[PDB]
Amino acid sequence: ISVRGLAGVENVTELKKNFNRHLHFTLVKDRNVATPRDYYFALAHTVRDHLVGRWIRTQQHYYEKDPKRIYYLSLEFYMGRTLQNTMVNLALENACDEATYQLGLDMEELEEIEEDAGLGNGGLGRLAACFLDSMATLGLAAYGYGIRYEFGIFNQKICGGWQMEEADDWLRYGNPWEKARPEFTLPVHFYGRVEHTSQGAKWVDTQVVLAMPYDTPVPGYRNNVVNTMRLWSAKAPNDFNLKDFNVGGYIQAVLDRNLAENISRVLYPNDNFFEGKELRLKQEYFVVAATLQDIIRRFKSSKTNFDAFPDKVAIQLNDTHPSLAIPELMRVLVDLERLDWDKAWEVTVKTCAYTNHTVIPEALERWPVHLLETLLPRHLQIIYEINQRFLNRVAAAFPGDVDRLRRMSLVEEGAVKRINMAHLCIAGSHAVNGVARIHSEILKKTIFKDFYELEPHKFQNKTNGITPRRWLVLCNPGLAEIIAERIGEEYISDLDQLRKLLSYVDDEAFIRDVAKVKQENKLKFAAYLEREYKVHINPNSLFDVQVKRIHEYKRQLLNCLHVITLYNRIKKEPNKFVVPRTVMIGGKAAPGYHMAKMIIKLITAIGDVVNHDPVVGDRLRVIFLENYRVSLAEKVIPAADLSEQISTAGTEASGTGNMKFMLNGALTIGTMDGANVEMAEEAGEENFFIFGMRVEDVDRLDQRGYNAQEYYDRIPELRQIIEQLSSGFFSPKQPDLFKDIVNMLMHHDRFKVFADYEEYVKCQERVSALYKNPREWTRMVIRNIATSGKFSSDRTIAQYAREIWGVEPSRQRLPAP
Amino acid sequence: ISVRGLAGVENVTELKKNFNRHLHFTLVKDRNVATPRDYYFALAHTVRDHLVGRWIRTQQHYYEKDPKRIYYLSLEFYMGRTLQNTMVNLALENACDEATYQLGLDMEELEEIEEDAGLGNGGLGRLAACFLDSMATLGLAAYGYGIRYEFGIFNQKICGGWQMEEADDWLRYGNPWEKARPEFTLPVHFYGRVEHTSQGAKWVDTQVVLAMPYDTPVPGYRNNVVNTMRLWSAKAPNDFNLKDFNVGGYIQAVLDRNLAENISRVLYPNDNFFEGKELRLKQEYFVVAATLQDIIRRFKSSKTNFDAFPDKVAIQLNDTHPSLAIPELMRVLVDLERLDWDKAWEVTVKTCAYTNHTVIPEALERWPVHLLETLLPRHLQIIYEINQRFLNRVAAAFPGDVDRLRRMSLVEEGAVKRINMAHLCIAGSHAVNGVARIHSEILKKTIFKDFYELEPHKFQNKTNGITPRRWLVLCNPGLAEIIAERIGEEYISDLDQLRKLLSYVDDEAFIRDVAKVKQENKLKFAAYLEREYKVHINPNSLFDVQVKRIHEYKRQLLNCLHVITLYNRIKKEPNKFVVPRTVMIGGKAAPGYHMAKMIIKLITAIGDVVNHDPVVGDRLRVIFLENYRVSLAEKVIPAADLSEQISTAGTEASGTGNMKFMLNGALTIGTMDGANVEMAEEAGEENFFIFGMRVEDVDRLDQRGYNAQEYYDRIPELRQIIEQLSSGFFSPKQPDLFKDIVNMLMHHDRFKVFADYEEYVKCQERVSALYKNPREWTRMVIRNIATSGKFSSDRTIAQYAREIWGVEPSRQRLPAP
Ligand SMILES: O=C(NC(=O)c1ccccc1)N[C@@H]1O[C@H](CO)[C@@H](O)[C@H](O)[C@H]1O
Ligand SMILES: O=C(NC(=O)c1ccccc1)N[C@@H]1O[C@H](CO)[C@@H](O)[C@H](O)[C@H]1O
Ligand SMILES: O=C(NC(=O)c1ccccc1)N[C@@H]1O[C@H](CO)[C@@H](O)[C@H](O)[C@H]1O
Ligand SMILES: O=C(NC(=O)c1ccccc1)N[C@@H]1O[C@H](CO)[C@@H](O)[C@H](O)[C@H]1O
Ligand SMILES: *Cc1c(COP(=O)(O)O)cnc(C)c1O
Ligand SMILES: *Cc1c(COP(=O)(O)O)cnc(C)c1O
């Protein structure tokens, strides 16, 4: 049925009886009242049972061997569903498929019942999830640490073409994958004040909030390793949250417990602008304070000289969100352990490493000093001391460079004083990395130039990657099978072996097969679109898709302009042939991001005109993919023909969706941005659809001055589109509905959409020409898939391991379960 | 080892392997890191597995047979721990005892880890729990319906002799006994307004709150019947609690979900005064609205003529708390089902029955009309209509009795209009009952005289009872064994058979045995007092205990006066012999009940003086039992010698603790109040220590006028005590600390403590005389235990069943598991 593993006779029999066991004793049901949800749960429990054995030994192994431990701190872990992924890494997929079949059930139908663990916004969160999988697969003693939000990323509903946010109550029916561990609750402090007494500083009169951990198993690919992802939940103490006597009301006191537990209540959906809310700072300290106590406690056991701390501990900071870990490690070392400053700092720097994910200014965390002053007084004092000593180092290296001193400070003066968390991370980490070659170069040349000049050795690059298990074997078993048929299975944990596929580029059989799975994928998706969303699309057209969070820099708007152009060209010459296209755009907009929400409305408004024009027929379809999330990505990507990666050169740090499409047989049309540069470089520019300005062209335009009017004046096709928008062509009842978009495009477009319009349209024409030649299109596809091996997160993790953490990856199977 | 069941070789082997199974797959632990808590959980899960089979068939049986269903609605279910009770009703106690022994564990130690399900204040809540057990044991198709509070009754801490309330986070480590059932969530409405349109009224624009049920199994005694207790949890909808757009903040919207979920957050600890808070009214409608939908849905399946509704459904209201069930049944029948009023009312009255638990005015629920108007507009309209028609019935029966009309109204005029919920319950129920003969007579003669005259057939009596399984076999296995040794085991589900023990009253062997288990119980308790509370008491002294919630009417104060007298007599004649006594007083005070909290302080203040007076020696010890609750009651009661049931005649509706002591070998000193009257009547007044005024004497005193000064003037011993209190004898640092108590005792004592002082002290002297004669004391004990059969809740339930519900109890075993 596929290399989803063997379906042993004893294995299938055992699975079946354990499924019935759980349905009865665990769910307390019987085949006569069980709903598909109960069936999903019976199965999830049966599969989960196979992890326990390995989970306990893996952890036991690390205790005995005592290897260097890697701690990945992130406020986001975009996990998605875990049932199928678990069957895959455990080689149980076929056995479970058979067993459920015999019990008279459809496994695929049950898999659709599982909720997505949406504890992330997009790329940054999903990277942590791919990393956890690769770390387990490469046998590293790694732990994922984060917050267990009861509400993850909101569920997107489109109402009247507008995005509506709805709470994601993913825990409603329970999470069979987690294991609560109250025996490990830890106390986290907030507020209070600092007392300077004889022997050191003391943080007192603090408000206490408890951190209760929940452990989720992270199984490596067929190596019997099961690592742990520990997520903290906020809990109020039963005393003072009732004990601070002297009136107020007993009832009120217990009802007010929810104020402390609000910390882990919801994931912040803000993607673009840095708000600076107090609740968010709390979430950040909460995950940091609880995690470090856990890290140090585990170290103290190992095998009190903290000199060996960096030899046993590695802490990777996923962006600046968990940056408080630096001053928090110092506080503990200096205040509680009583280490001298200098010794404590040496230790801290040697164990911390920081990862940057963007260069846009509005996203940078710059916390008001008055907030840190009230909430974390001692940390502010430690940050000031860190700054003092750091600036003393700068002054000594660049004497008299008074301006460099203010540029490099961790403290920003002005309206309100703020602490630049990124500067804090650079000063307190022994390594700082970008997520793609071009991005890492930009960090050295621009944003962190002063820091690079001070300590060049700190800056590195670690190009992002995706996990081939979830992003190929799991979502595209068909494609995975035909590949395995020719080169074997070893590539699933060694993606570089995909290169061997280059020798089949002229294979008439392979070409036919590659083209066949893609057609099957498209038919399956086209069906799902009608089943769950009733719309109907032509599976013979080119599937043009751009799925990612809605941002001005991602330029979904540039895509919209192309779509309107196509429609206008058809209306001009109705009886001329054009390659049919089904362009799908999907993604969530941050709730307070007005422009982003205006763009979602435009997309649906275009579809309302285009999808009902009789002259267009089935030649052009504009579809907005509702509620884009991980489980939905697993469906669209394998079915896409054209992947849109059109950000303004220099704005997308790396991108990972782009790597997901390349691995699944879609061709890419994009700019020389982020990882796009390395993908084209791996597959050859001839096998890529590159267009638009390069980072340098954008700069040149900026020196000169970007004037949108110039393009409006010289391109009739562009002018016509803008007039359609202004006249209400796409919004009859509300003629001025899109005045904000037109206004922005013409007067304040930071992303030069117009500047790339002409080259983008022409490039899109070359894509349509190649699609007209099935054989050649597929041959190009084979060359993209065959050279995508570099983008596996196993490669990324092996580099972090070797160049940053100081640990050697191992593909050695753990001593059975 | 006892008639805790057989310990079969195959049974013990099976238990052991399943314990290891759960420890591994369920707890995800291994013998090397397991804590006693993990062990308790492994066992709880192993025991719980034996209920599933029976639970599913019992429910399946009721579906097929379709018997009349009994629904017990209560806002309180004081369950206590369920591990041991489950082993008892399943005859697994000895097998589990053996199995854990072989695994090298102490079962008793593990049992102590379980948390008490403290979803009740005291007697009313614990009665519901005893009733659920008896209903299962008598094979009735009964369901307990209530609210699943995440915080039950507060944990009492004594600080400086003062009571401190602390949140009871009983769900912290999880509840292995419940089974969440989200597939049965139901919507409950609040607020809104009423619309009168062509065909009937309509309740619109209501705020919606979801009710998610959690099912807990209620196993009958060795009959394989497992009934269900369904507890509702409040959940917010994910839409409007985020969907009511137009600014406010996305974050805020999801954080504000806690406002709707606050409904099931905490149990109201108010014992004495009726507050009338909005949150409480919500809790009451919430349990009523969700339960009725569930009841009707189950009826519609059965086997739409609601004419047969009362033949298939019986709804017992535990006090007026769930009284909204009456107008809510009408709303559904009239508004939704479209039945004519009269037909709907006939149905409602025939299915509802009401139980009264007190006659004190301050406890009666009288809801302000403005509250019902805002929160439940339609119900207010239905209540007014009910009142109209009812008063029309009264006017027709007593023409011209204009005053009877105002006395009987459900609507009370005055300062603020209120709805008298008790009047509502009488009008809408076919049966109204008191909980003890004297109490039921008082209801007819006083409080409900007008209603009794109108419909005499409605009023009944159903004297309370306690379950012999938990209150004998479970907490006093020793005593249960020696009884079984002589008369067999049949008495555990037929307590009347205890009468057979009368023929052993002169048995030298039995006398020695009865006296021996009590001494063993006292030594065990004396040890527990030092282990967990470090204090040290003499196990040879008389154990004088009064445990129950602190109320002025229970007169813990009358007890305190006796204690001070004893101490004063010893100080007067130090070298005179007196029967050593260890008087223990325990109970929680409602948080806002000032007087009650002042009484707790007095008790501890007395102990501070008495327990450290060298002249007193070990002759007198005053101990305050911290955090009195069900699990603690299971410990003290079996170890008590003297049970204090000294409420003012006419104030304690029934009492049940009194029945718990009688069954466990303690002698009773009390007034002719509540059930005390029937207990003395069953055992013979010669075998009881009765004293004080009878209900009539209290009345006579009231006509005359109660003047405390009179007693103060004529009793020197009493005068001396009051002067000790006023002078600061018991509060050196704060001489006037107890001025409020003295002031109340002298000028506003509604409970005539002084009036019963002299007779109480003299009676206490007769108790001390009998204790000096071991043989005779024990012989009297045998006569109390031998005549306590009447007080089993099986008898109570059999009467409710026959005289109110119209169903026949059955002791028939269900067809195996
Ligand atoms: O929540 C989990 N999770 C797991 O057992 C588990 C096992 C393997 C992998 C992931 C989760 N288990 C739960 O642990 C509580 C407390 O011990 C039990 O009462 C409950 O019945 C059980 O399902
Ligand atoms: O997704 C984010 N950032 C956020 O989601 C985010 C979350 C909270 C606050 C600010 C930004 N960054 C993304 O991280 C991925 C993985 O490195 C990159 O490939 C991508 O180019 C970048 O934009
Ligand atoms: O909470 C319970 N309770 C019981 O199974 C149970 C069984 C018999 C008697 C009382 C409770 N079970 C729980 O049900 C959830 C959802 O199906 C599972 O994910 C979880 O592992 C299981 O322990
Ligand atoms: O316990 C209560 N009442 C409350 O706890 C209560 C709870 C909420 C609001 C008001 C009273 N009543 C008690 O119910 C038992 C059982 O019928 C009687 O024996 C006892 O005499 C009576 O006082
Ligand atoms: C891969 C992924 C992302 C990241 O996509 P980009 O194109 O890098 O912005 C975002 N969301 C989901 C659901 C993903 O699977
Ligand atoms: C039995 C019981 C009660 C009721 O006692 P009374 O003496 O009737 O007031 C109260 N609390 C607990 C814990 C009980 O077990």
PDB file of C-alpha atoms and ligand atoms in Angstrom, chain A residues 76 120-125 127 268-273 280 318-319 321 355-358 363 365 435 464 549 553-554 651-656 659, ligand 2:
ATOM      1  CA  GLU A  76       5.590  29.667  19.714  1.00  0.00           C
ATOM      2  CA  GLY A 120       2.112  29.822  16.663  1.00  0.00           C
ATOM      3  CA  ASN A 121       1.490  32.611  14.153  1.00  0.00           C
ATOM      4  CA  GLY A 122       3.387  31.309  11.132  1.00  0.00           C
ATOM      5  CA  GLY A 123       6.991  30.752  10.070  1.00  0.00           C
ATOM      6  CA  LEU A 124       8.825  31.412  13.340  1.00  0.00           C
ATOM      7  CA  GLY A 125       6.515  29.058  15.247  1.00  0.00           C
ATOM      8  CA  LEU A 127      10.295  26.498  12.410  1.00  0.00           C
ATOM      9  CA  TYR A 268      -0.642  37.063  20.800  1.00  0.00           C
ATOM     10  CA  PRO A 269      -1.689  37.150  17.094  1.00  0.00           C
ATOM     11  CA  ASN A 270       0.389  40.213  16.326  1.00  0.00           C
ATOM     12  CA  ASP A 271       2.521  39.506  13.334  1.00  0.00           C
ATOM     13  CA  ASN A 272       3.755  42.897  12.158  1.00  0.00           C
ATOM     14  CA  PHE A 273       3.713  45.709  14.693  1.00  0.00           C
ATOM     15  CA  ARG A 280       2.926  39.987  26.707  1.00  0.00           C
ATOM     16  CA  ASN A 318      13.998  31.967  19.111  1.00  0.00           C
ATOM     17  CA  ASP A 319      13.978  35.717  18.397  1.00  0.00           C
ATOM     18  CA  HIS A 321      10.878  37.046  22.804  1.00  0.00           C
ATOM     19  CA  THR A 355      18.328  33.854  16.250  1.00  0.00           C
ATOM     20  CA  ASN A 356      17.025  36.895  14.306  1.00  0.00           C
ATOM     21  CA  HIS A 357      13.987  36.541  12.005  1.00  0.00           C
ATOM     22  CA  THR A 358      13.429  40.000  10.473  1.00  0.00           C
ATOM     23  CA  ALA A 363       8.701  44.282  14.574  1.00  0.00           C
ATOM     24  CA  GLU A 365      10.982  44.629  20.599  1.00  0.00           C
ATOM     25  CA  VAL A 435      17.984  32.491   8.792  1.00  0.00           C
ATOM     26  CA  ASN A 464      16.166  27.556   7.475  1.00  0.00           C
ATOM     27  CA  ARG A 549       0.201  35.423   6.738  1.00  0.00           C
ATOM     28  CA  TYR A 553       5.891  43.133   2.510  1.00  0.00           C
ATOM     29  CA  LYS A 554       4.764  39.692   1.263  1.00  0.00           C
ATOM     30  CA  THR A 651      12.253  41.990   3.457  1.00  0.00           C
ATOM     31  CA  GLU A 652      11.553  38.240   3.868  1.00  0.00           C
ATOM     32  CA  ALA A 653      14.337  36.954   6.148  1.00  0.00           C
ATOM     33  CA  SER A 654      14.053  33.455   4.708  1.00  0.00           C
ATOM     34  CA  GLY A 655      10.580  32.008   4.188  1.00  0.00           C
ATOM     35  CA  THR A 656       9.863  28.279   4.606  1.00  0.00           C
ATOM     36  CA  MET A 659      10.790  25.184   0.581  1.00  0.00           C
TER      37      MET A 659
HETATM   38  O1  LIG C   2       7.067  34.339  11.571  1.00  0.00           O
HETATM   39  C1  LIG C   2       7.865  35.212  11.944  1.00  0.00           C
HETATM   40  N1  LIG C   2       7.568  36.031  13.002  1.00  0.00           N
HETATM   41  C2  LIG C   2       6.420  36.000  13.764  1.00  0.00           C
HETATM   42  O2  LIG C   2       5.491  35.206  13.567  1.00  0.00           O
HETATM   43  C3  LIG C   2       6.250  36.976  14.911  1.00  0.00           C
HETATM   44  C4  LIG C   2       5.594  36.543  16.108  1.00  0.00           C
HETATM   45  C5  LIG C   2       5.425  37.436  17.204  1.00  0.00           C
HETATM   46  C6  LIG C   2       5.916  38.766  17.116  1.00  0.00           C
HETATM   47  C7  LIG C   2       6.571  39.208  15.932  1.00  0.00           C
HETATM   48  C8  LIG C   2       6.739  38.315  14.840  1.00  0.00           C
HETATM   49  N2  LIG C   2       9.049  35.334  11.264  1.00  0.00           N
HETATM   50  C9  LIG C   2       9.356  34.458  10.141  1.00  0.00           C
HETATM   51  O3  LIG C   2      10.198  33.370  10.628  1.00  0.00           O
HETATM   52  C10 LIG C   2      10.519  32.416   9.592  1.00  0.00           C
HETATM   53  C11 LIG C   2      11.386  31.305  10.241  1.00  0.00           C
HETATM   54  O4  LIG C   2      12.686  31.843  10.549  1.00  0.00           O
HETATM   55  C12 LIG C   2      11.236  33.099   8.382  1.00  0.00           C
HETATM   56  O5  LIG C   2      11.507  32.154   7.334  1.00  0.00           O
HETATM   57  C13 LIG C   2      10.334  34.221   7.816  1.00  0.00           C
HETATM   58  O6  LIG C   2      10.964  34.898   6.716  1.00  0.00           O
HETATM   59  C14 LIG C   2      10.051  35.237   8.967  1.00  0.00           C
HETATM   60  O7  LIG C   2       9.209  36.313   8.524  1.00  0.00           O
END
